Amino acid sequence: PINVAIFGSTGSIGTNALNIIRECNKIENVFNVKALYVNKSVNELYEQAREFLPEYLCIHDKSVYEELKELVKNIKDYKPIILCGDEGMKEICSSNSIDKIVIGIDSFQGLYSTMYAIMNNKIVALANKESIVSAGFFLKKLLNIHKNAKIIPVDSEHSAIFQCLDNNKVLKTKCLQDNFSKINNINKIFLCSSGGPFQNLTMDELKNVTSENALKHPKWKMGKKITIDSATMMNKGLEVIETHFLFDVDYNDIEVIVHKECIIHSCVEFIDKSVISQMYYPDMQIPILYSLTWPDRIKTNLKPLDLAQVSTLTFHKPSLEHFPCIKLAYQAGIKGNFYPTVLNASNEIANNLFLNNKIKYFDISSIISQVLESFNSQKVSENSEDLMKQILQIHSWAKDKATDIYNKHN
Amino acid sequence: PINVAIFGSTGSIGTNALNIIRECNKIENVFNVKALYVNKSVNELYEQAREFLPEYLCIHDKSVYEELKELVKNIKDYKPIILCGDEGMKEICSSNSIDKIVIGIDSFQGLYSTMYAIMNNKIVALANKESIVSAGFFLKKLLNIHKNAKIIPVDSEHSAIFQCLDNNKVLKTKCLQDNFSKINNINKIFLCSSGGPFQNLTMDELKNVTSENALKHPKWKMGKKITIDSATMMNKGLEVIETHFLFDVDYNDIEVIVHKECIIHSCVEFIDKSVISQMYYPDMQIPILYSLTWPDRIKTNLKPLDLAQVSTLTFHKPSLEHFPCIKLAYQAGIKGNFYPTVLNASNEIANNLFLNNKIKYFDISSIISQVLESFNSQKVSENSEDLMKQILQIHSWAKDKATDIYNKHN
Ligand SMILES: Cc1ccc([C@@H](CC(=O)N(C)O)CP(=O)(O)O)cc1
Ligand SMILES: Cc1ccc([C@@H](CC(=O)N(C)O)CP(=O)(O)O)cc1
Ligand SMILES: [Mn+2]
Ligand SMILES: [Mn+2]
């Protein structure tokens, strides 16, 4: 019986997690939902709570804390531990009654619970790629300290890559650990992408796209922020850096491939040149589930892939000209240092502006490119808490600088 | 270092095996070729011996054994143990200095070599599916007795499927053994086929196709017999049974899929419904190579898969009306008992007649169908030696029944 906590339980990853968990539990009782944690969604949490009845509830924003107790009151034969903020978050990570933590809080704020999940040597099922991109080297140092903690990727491409690996080797290492790719005989990664809605647009058509265009006909069901990143392929860029960090794969050996059917989720090339890939319908339930069952698999009632019906699969290289965010991610990644933290922060800002109709598509890459330009390598703090503050310092600087470039521009 | 013997070393899989070994040793000296064994190619063996300098040489035809000794005298700083016929074979199989045997021989002689390799607890890289199809029962019994013996599949679809498995699990069990499927969480198999050259033909065009038609559009570099089997899709049929036996997958759960680009070489659907696949250019070098390095992988100079250039992959179900051998194979296999030995032996005859323009395309399946129809289940021998005799008796009976049906035609 696997004891599980969900951070960001009402988010797209959270709901998907609870769903596959509920379906797998009907087949055979395998998961116990021990803890749910949301940012500010108290009605939604209350309804998850009545259904899954975990031991811990945790709302972050402490204003609506007393209100949550008000709703959960009205659930009979049930009284869970109710917490707030990072004190709840921490109490939860340290509970011995919990083994795996799904991190479905999905921006730089998710770093804290990831950090605390690792510090308590848990299995961390991680869907927050921003934290690996911003804090990769930090997480790597923290993992070297917490020897029994494990990051299991949930981001679907990285889960794919991870599922293409021989657990006989994986178990000799772990994600975010130097030498991972050598021990797994990995030569190269095909990092597949839906391409987003703008793949077939000309340069001129591209210049004009809006957030409304970007949000139309989602190939996956997801939040607004990553939908914009998919549109610019900043999502893929970030995932290039995430790949580098999770699997210690050089940037020369990560190739982005546009696969519009969303069936092959990514592929691994091994040192003999054999390639192994993972396929399924575009559904987040598989990668979430595998992160909770690894190194095993369990039965689901999910619809089986019908390859004949799907019939065709296609692959092409994205144009860096049309998708310059991809180039910027590689550049920042290759330069290393805190350039990735800057990439991610400036993008939080450019992303949201474009989503809110404040700038144009190419303004997104221009702003980001200028903030990267204006940053100078810093000496990397040896001390772990110094490194944290440094990362926050640079992240907050990068956001402010991006906002400044937008504000000074007509 | 990997200590390998090659049986049938001047043959197709033989020379392929030595080619990938030669290329891999140039990168990093990895394989020690311990024994070469040929039927009666004196000069070729001498030439391979000069290159790989194995400790054992063996030629089957005793008439050339003295000639061979004269030849190898001219290789400097070389004094191998030179043998002949089945005795040399068995002696090689008994050497503690040999870990893996590539079986590159067909017909009984190859089954005999397989048996002796297994009786000696070796790893057997088996590139001859007819023995699994026909003698599946016997091999399975044998592998139960010799617990440390392993069969590793070389047939490329089966290699692919094997490459798609988690060796953490594979190592708890082995191929051709009850429970392999349960232990590896395997739910279903996509068994990919090139489709051969007749996929788009109508029933009426099919009626009149010739062996000359069949031997066009060679997508892999292959011998005549398997090329005809590819055209009829009897190859895939046999391989369906091969899959049943190697991986303990029910026939209901093996789906033949026509994939004309020959990049995805087969796929495994696990019980969560996640699917894992192996891709590469159509080449027989990876599968041979993986059979020799499993559970590891080693570096090659093979041309990397360029997915963007490959660009498109296609999948459709084959029409059973057009390729009836497929149906016969499932029928024979599902019926079990010695029906697959009969299927295989009748096809041997049917295939060769069509190759030589003695019968038409639908006659192949017709002859085979009749032989299956005329065969009566026999109680299966408990005794390993009696079982082998049954298999041979039935195989000889079926060849003769098929010839007889052809003879009495018109
Ligand atoms: C609408 C939309 C479409 C697609 C995405 C992403 C989703 C993702 O990152 N997964 C599933 O792991 C895929 P991509 O960056 O290749 O376009 C997000 C939103
Ligand atoms: C010309 C030709 C083309 C293809 C084959 C076979 C080869 C095979 O079975 N491999 C390589 O494992 C593939 P299929 O039966 O799917 O057509 C044989 C001959
Ligand atoms: Mn992703
Ligand atoms: Mn094959």
CSV table of C-alpha atoms in Angstrom, one decimal, chain B residues 26-337:
chain,number,residue,atom,x,y,z
B,26,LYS,CA,37.9,-1.2,-33.1
B,27,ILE,CA,36.2,1.4,-30.9
B,28,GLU,CA,37.0,-0.5,-27.7
B,29,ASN,CA,38.3,-4.1,-27.4
B,30,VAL,CA,35.2,-5.8,-26.0
B,31,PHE,CA,34.5,-9.2,-27.6
B,32,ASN,CA,36.7,-12.3,-27.5
B,33,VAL,CA,35.6,-14.6,-30.3
B,34,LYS,CA,36.3,-17.9,-28.8
B,35,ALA,CA,35.0,-20.3,-31.4
B,36,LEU,CA,34.0,-20.3,-35.0
B,37,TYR,CA,32.0,-23.3,-36.5
B,38,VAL,CA,31.1,-23.7,-40.2
B,39,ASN,CA,29.6,-26.5,-42.3
B,40,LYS,CA,32.1,-26.7,-45.2
B,41,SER,CA,33.5,-23.3,-46.1
B,42,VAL,CA,37.3,-24.1,-45.6
B,43,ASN,CA,38.7,-20.9,-47.0
B,44,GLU,CA,36.2,-18.5,-45.5
B,45,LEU,CA,36.7,-20.0,-42.0
B,46,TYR,CA,40.5,-19.8,-42.5
B,47,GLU,CA,40.0,-16.1,-43.4
B,48,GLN,CA,37.8,-15.5,-40.3
B,49,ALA,CA,40.2,-17.4,-38.1
B,50,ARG,CA,43.1,-15.2,-39.3
B,51,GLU,CA,41.2,-12.2,-38.2
B,52,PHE,CA,39.4,-13.2,-35.0
B,53,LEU,CA,41.9,-15.8,-33.9
B,54,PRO,CA,39.5,-18.0,-31.9
B,55,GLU,CA,40.7,-20.6,-29.5
B,56,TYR,CA,38.4,-23.2,-31.1
B,57,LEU,CA,37.8,-23.8,-34.8
B,58,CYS,CA,35.4,-26.5,-36.0
B,59,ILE,CA,34.3,-27.6,-39.4
B,60,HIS,CA,31.4,-30.0,-39.8
B,61,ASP,CA,32.4,-31.8,-43.0
B,62,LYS,CA,35.2,-34.2,-42.0
B,63,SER,CA,36.5,-34.4,-45.6
B,64,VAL,CA,38.0,-30.9,-45.3
B,65,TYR,CA,39.3,-31.2,-41.7
B,66,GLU,CA,42.9,-31.9,-42.8
B,67,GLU,CA,42.8,-29.1,-45.4
B,68,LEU,CA,41.7,-26.7,-42.7
B,69,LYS,CA,44.7,-27.7,-40.5
B,70,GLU,CA,47.0,-27.0,-43.4
B,71,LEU,CA,45.5,-23.5,-44.0
B,72,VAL,CA,45.7,-22.3,-40.3
B,73,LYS,CA,49.3,-23.4,-40.1
B,74,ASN,CA,50.0,-20.2,-42.0
B,75,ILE,CA,48.5,-17.9,-39.4
B,76,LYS,CA,51.3,-16.8,-37.1
B,77,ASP,CA,51.3,-17.0,-33.4
B,78,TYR,CA,48.2,-19.0,-33.6
B,79,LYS,CA,47.5,-22.6,-32.5
B,80,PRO,CA,43.8,-23.1,-31.9
B,81,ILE,CA,42.0,-26.3,-31.0
B,82,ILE,CA,40.8,-27.6,-34.3
B,83,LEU,CA,37.8,-30.0,-34.3
B,84,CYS,CA,35.1,-31.3,-36.7
B,85,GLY,CA,31.5,-32.6,-36.9
B,86,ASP,CA,29.1,-32.7,-34.0
B,87,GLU,CA,31.9,-33.7,-31.6
B,88,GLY,CA,33.7,-30.4,-32.1
B,89,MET,CA,30.3,-28.7,-31.7
B,90,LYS,CA,29.7,-30.3,-28.3
B,91,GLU,CA,33.2,-29.8,-27.1
B,92,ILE,CA,32.9,-26.1,-27.9
B,93,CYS,CA,29.6,-26.0,-26.1
B,94,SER,CA,31.2,-27.5,-23.0
B,95,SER,CA,34.1,-25.0,-22.8
B,96,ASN,CA,33.9,-22.9,-19.6
B,97,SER,CA,35.7,-20.2,-21.6
B,98,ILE,CA,32.5,-19.6,-23.7
B,99,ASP,CA,29.6,-17.6,-22.3
B,100,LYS,CA,27.4,-16.9,-25.3
B,101,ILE,CA,26.7,-18.8,-28.5
B,102,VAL,CA,25.3,-17.2,-31.7
B,103,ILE,CA,23.3,-19.9,-33.4
B,104,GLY,CA,23.5,-19.2,-37.1
B,105,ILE,CA,22.5,-22.5,-38.4
B,106,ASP,CA,19.1,-23.7,-39.6
B,107,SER,CA,17.2,-27.0,-39.7
B,108,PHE,CA,17.7,-29.9,-37.2
B,109,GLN,CA,21.5,-29.2,-37.1
B,110,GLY,CA,20.7,-25.9,-35.5
B,111,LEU,CA,18.3,-27.3,-33.0
B,112,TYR,CA,20.9,-29.9,-32.1
B,113,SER,CA,23.5,-27.1,-31.5
B,114,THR,CA,20.9,-25.1,-29.5
B,115,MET,CA,20.2,-28.1,-27.3
B,116,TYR,CA,23.9,-28.7,-26.5
B,117,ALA,CA,24.3,-24.9,-25.9
B,118,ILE,CA,21.4,-25.1,-23.4
B,119,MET,CA,22.5,-28.4,-21.8
B,120,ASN,CA,25.8,-26.5,-21.1
B,121,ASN,CA,23.9,-23.5,-19.4
B,122,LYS,CA,25.0,-21.0,-22.0
B,123,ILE,CA,23.4,-17.9,-23.3
B,124,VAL,CA,22.1,-18.7,-26.7
B,125,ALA,CA,21.6,-15.9,-29.2
B,126,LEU,CA,19.0,-17.6,-31.4
B,127,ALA,CA,18.5,-16.3,-34.9
B,128,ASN,CA,16.3,-19.1,-36.1
B,129,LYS,CA,12.6,-18.9,-35.3
B,130,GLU,CA,11.6,-22.1,-37.0
B,131,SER,CA,13.1,-24.1,-34.1
B,132,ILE,CA,11.0,-22.0,-31.5
B,133,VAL,CA,7.9,-22.5,-33.5
B,134,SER,CA,8.3,-26.2,-34.2
B,135,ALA,CA,10.2,-27.2,-31.0
B,136,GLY,CA,8.9,-24.7,-28.5
B,137,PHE,CA,7.7,-27.4,-26.1
B,138,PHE,CA,11.1,-29.1,-26.2
B,139,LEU,CA,13.1,-25.9,-25.7
B,140,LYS,CA,10.9,-24.9,-22.8
B,141,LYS,CA,11.2,-28.3,-21.0
B,142,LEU,CA,15.0,-28.1,-21.6
B,143,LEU,CA,15.3,-24.5,-20.2
B,144,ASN,CA,13.5,-25.7,-17.1
B,145,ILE,CA,16.1,-28.3,-16.5
B,146,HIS,CA,19.1,-26.2,-17.3
B,147,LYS,CA,18.3,-23.3,-15.1
B,148,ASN,CA,21.2,-21.1,-16.0
B,149,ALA,CA,20.8,-21.5,-19.8
B,150,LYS,CA,19.2,-18.6,-21.5
B,151,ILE,CA,17.8,-17.9,-24.9
B,152,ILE,CA,18.1,-14.4,-26.1
B,153,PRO,CA,16.0,-13.5,-29.2
B,154,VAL,CA,17.8,-12.2,-32.3
B,155,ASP,CA,14.8,-12.1,-34.7
B,156,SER,CA,14.5,-8.4,-35.0
B,157,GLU,CA,10.9,-7.9,-33.8
B,158,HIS,CA,11.6,-10.1,-30.8
B,159,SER,CA,14.9,-8.4,-30.0
B,160,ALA,CA,12.9,-5.1,-30.1
B,161,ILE,CA,10.3,-6.4,-27.7
B,162,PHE,CA,13.1,-7.7,-25.5
B,163,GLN,CA,14.8,-4.3,-25.6
B,164,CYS,CA,11.6,-2.7,-24.4
B,165,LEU,CA,11.6,-4.7,-21.2
B,166,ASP,CA,12.9,-3.6,-17.8
B,167,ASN,CA,15.9,-5.9,-17.1
B,168,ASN,CA,15.2,-5.4,-13.4
B,169,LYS,CA,12.3,-7.8,-14.2
B,170,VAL,CA,13.8,-9.8,-17.1
B,171,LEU,CA,16.6,-10.9,-14.7
B,172,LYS,CA,14.0,-12.5,-12.3
B,173,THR,CA,12.8,-14.8,-15.1
B,174,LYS,CA,13.9,-15.7,-18.6
B,175,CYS,CA,12.6,-16.2,-22.2
B,176,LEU,CA,10.6,-19.3,-23.1
B,177,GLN,CA,9.5,-19.8,-19.5
B,178,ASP,CA,6.1,-19.7,-17.8
B,179,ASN,CA,5.2,-16.4,-16.1
B,180,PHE,CA,7.6,-14.2,-18.2
B,181,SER,CA,4.6,-12.0,-19.1
B,182,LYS,CA,3.5,-11.6,-15.5
B,183,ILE,CA,6.9,-10.8,-14.1
B,184,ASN,CA,7.4,-8.2,-16.8
B,185,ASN,CA,3.9,-6.6,-16.5
B,186,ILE,CA,3.4,-7.3,-20.2
B,187,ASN,CA,-0.2,-6.9,-21.3
B,188,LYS,CA,-0.1,-6.9,-25.1
B,189,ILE,CA,2.3,-7.0,-28.1
B,190,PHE,CA,2.4,-4.9,-31.3
B,191,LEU,CA,4.2,-7.1,-33.7
B,192,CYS,CA,5.3,-4.9,-36.6
B,193,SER,CA,5.7,-6.2,-40.1
B,194,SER,CA,7.0,-4.5,-43.3
B,195,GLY,CA,3.9,-5.9,-45.0
B,196,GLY,CA,6.0,-7.2,-47.9
B,197,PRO,CA,5.4,-6.0,-51.5
B,198,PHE,CA,1.8,-7.1,-51.9
B,199,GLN,CA,-0.1,-4.9,-49.4
B,200,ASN,CA,-2.0,-2.8,-51.9
B,201,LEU,CA,-2.9,-5.7,-54.3
B,202,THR,CA,-6.5,-6.9,-54.7
B,203,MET,CA,-7.5,-10.5,-54.2
B,204,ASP,CA,-7.5,-10.9,-58.0
B,205,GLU,CA,-4.0,-9.5,-58.5
B,206,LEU,CA,-2.9,-11.7,-55.6
B,207,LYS,CA,-4.1,-14.7,-57.4
B,208,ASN,CA,-1.5,-14.3,-60.0
B,209,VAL,CA,1.5,-13.0,-58.2
B,210,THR,CA,4.8,-14.8,-58.8
B,211,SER,CA,8.0,-15.5,-56.8
B,212,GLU,CA,9.6,-12.9,-59.2
B,213,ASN,CA,7.1,-10.3,-57.9
B,214,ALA,CA,7.8,-11.4,-54.3
B,215,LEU,CA,11.6,-10.9,-54.7
B,216,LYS,CA,11.2,-7.1,-55.5
B,217,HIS,CA,11.3,-4.1,-53.2
B,218,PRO,CA,13.7,-5.8,-50.6
B,219,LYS,CA,13.4,-3.6,-47.5
B,220,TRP,CA,15.8,-5.8,-45.6
B,221,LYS,CA,18.7,-7.7,-47.1
B,222,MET,CA,17.4,-11.3,-46.8
B,223,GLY,CA,17.4,-14.8,-48.2
B,224,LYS,CA,14.9,-16.2,-50.6
B,225,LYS,CA,12.9,-18.3,-48.2
B,226,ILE,CA,12.1,-15.6,-45.6
B,227,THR,CA,11.4,-13.2,-48.5
B,228,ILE,CA,8.6,-15.4,-49.7
B,229,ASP,CA,7.4,-15.7,-46.1
B,230,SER,CA,7.4,-11.9,-45.9
B,231,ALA,CA,5.3,-11.7,-49.0
B,232,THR,CA,2.7,-14.2,-47.7
B,233,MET,CA,3.0,-12.8,-44.2
B,234,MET,CA,3.7,-16.3,-43.1
B,235,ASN,CA,6.8,-14.8,-41.7
B,236,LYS,CA,4.7,-12.7,-39.3
B,237,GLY,CA,2.6,-15.8,-38.5
B,238,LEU,CA,5.5,-17.9,-37.4
B,239,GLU,CA,6.7,-14.8,-35.5
B,240,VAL,CA,3.4,-14.6,-33.7
B,241,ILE,CA,3.9,-18.1,-32.4
B,242,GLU,CA,7.5,-17.2,-31.7
B,243,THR,CA,6.2,-14.3,-29.5
B,244,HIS,CA,3.8,-16.6,-27.7
B,245,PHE,CA,6.7,-18.9,-26.8
B,246,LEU,CA,9.4,-16.4,-26.0
B,247,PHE,CA,7.3,-14.1,-23.8
B,248,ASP,CA,4.3,-16.1,-22.6
B,249,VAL,CA,1.9,-13.8,-24.2
B,250,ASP,CA,-1.6,-15.1,-25.1
B,251,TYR,CA,-2.5,-15.2,-28.8
B,252,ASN,CA,-5.4,-12.8,-28.2
B,253,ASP,CA,-2.8,-10.3,-27.0
B,254,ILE,CA,-0.5,-10.4,-30.0
B,255,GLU,CA,-1.5,-7.8,-32.7
B,256,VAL,CA,0.2,-7.8,-36.1
B,257,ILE,CA,0.7,-4.3,-37.4
B,258,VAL,CA,1.9,-3.4,-40.8
B,259,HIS,CA,4.5,-0.7,-40.7
B,260,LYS,CA,6.0,-0.2,-44.1
B,261,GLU,CA,8.9,2.2,-43.2
B,262,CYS,CA,10.5,-0.5,-40.9
B,263,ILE,CA,11.7,1.9,-38.3
B,264,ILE,CA,9.5,0.8,-35.3
B,265,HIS,CA,10.5,-2.8,-35.0
B,266,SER,CA,7.8,-3.8,-32.4
B,267,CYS,CA,6.1,-2.4,-29.3
B,268,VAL,CA,5.3,-3.7,-25.8
B,269,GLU,CA,2.1,-2.5,-24.0
B,270,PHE,CA,2.4,-2.9,-20.3
B,271,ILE,CA,-0.5,-3.4,-17.9
B,272,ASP,CA,-0.9,0.3,-17.2
B,273,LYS,CA,-1.3,0.6,-21.0
B,274,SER,CA,1.9,2.5,-21.4
B,275,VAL,CA,3.6,1.4,-24.6
B,276,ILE,CA,7.4,1.1,-25.2
B,277,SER,CA,9.0,0.7,-28.6
B,278,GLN,CA,12.3,0.1,-30.2
B,279,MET,CA,13.2,2.0,-33.4
B,280,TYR,CA,16.0,2.1,-35.7
B,281,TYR,CA,16.9,1.8,-39.4
B,282,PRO,CA,16.2,-1.7,-40.8
B,283,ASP,CA,19.4,-3.4,-39.9
B,284,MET,CA,20.1,-6.8,-38.4
B,285,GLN,CA,23.2,-5.5,-36.5
B,286,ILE,CA,21.5,-4.1,-33.5
B,287,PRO,CA,19.6,-7.2,-32.6
B,288,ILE,CA,22.6,-9.5,-33.0
B,289,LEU,CA,24.6,-7.0,-31.0
B,290,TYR,CA,22.1,-6.6,-28.2
B,291,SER,CA,21.9,-10.4,-27.9
B,292,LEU,CA,25.6,-10.4,-27.2
B,293,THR,CA,25.7,-7.5,-24.8
B,294,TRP,CA,22.5,-7.9,-22.9
B,295,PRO,CA,21.9,-7.0,-20.2
B,296,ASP,CA,24.4,-4.2,-21.2
B,297,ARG,CA,24.9,-2.0,-24.2
B,298,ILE,CA,28.1,-0.9,-25.9
B,299,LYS,CA,29.2,1.9,-28.2
B,300,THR,CA,28.9,1.6,-32.0
B,301,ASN,CA,29.7,3.7,-35.1
B,302,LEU,CA,26.3,2.9,-36.6
B,303,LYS,CA,24.6,5.8,-38.5
B,304,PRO,CA,22.3,7.5,-36.0
B,305,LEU,CA,18.6,7.5,-36.5
B,306,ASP,CA,17.6,10.8,-38.1
B,307,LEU,CA,13.8,11.0,-37.2
B,308,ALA,CA,13.3,14.3,-38.9
B,309,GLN,CA,14.5,12.9,-42.2
B,310,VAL,CA,12.5,9.7,-41.7
B,311,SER,CA,9.7,12.1,-41.2
B,312,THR,CA,6.6,9.8,-41.4
B,313,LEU,CA,5.7,6.5,-39.8
B,314,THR,CA,2.6,4.5,-40.9
B,315,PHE,CA,0.5,1.7,-39.3
B,316,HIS,CA,-2.4,-0.4,-40.5
B,317,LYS,CA,-3.9,-3.7,-39.8
B,318,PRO,CA,-3.2,-6.4,-42.3
B,319,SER,CA,-6.2,-7.9,-44.3
B,320,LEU,CA,-6.6,-11.5,-43.3
B,321,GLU,CA,-8.5,-12.3,-46.5
B,322,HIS,CA,-5.4,-11.1,-48.5
B,323,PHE,CA,-2.9,-12.7,-46.2
B,324,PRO,CA,-4.6,-15.9,-45.0
B,325,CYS,CA,-1.3,-17.5,-43.7
B,326,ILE,CA,-1.6,-15.0,-40.8
B,327,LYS,CA,-5.0,-16.6,-39.8
B,328,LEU,CA,-3.6,-20.1,-40.2
B,329,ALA,CA,-0.7,-19.2,-37.9
B,330,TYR,CA,-3.0,-18.0,-35.2
B,331,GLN,CA,-5.2,-21.0,-35.7
B,332,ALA,CA,-2.4,-23.5,-35.5
B,333,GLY,CA,-0.9,-21.7,-32.5
B,334,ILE,CA,-4.2,-21.4,-30.6
B,335,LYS,CA,-4.9,-25.0,-31.2
B,336,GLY,CA,-1.5,-25.8,-29.7
B,337,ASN,CA,-0.3,-29.4,-29.4
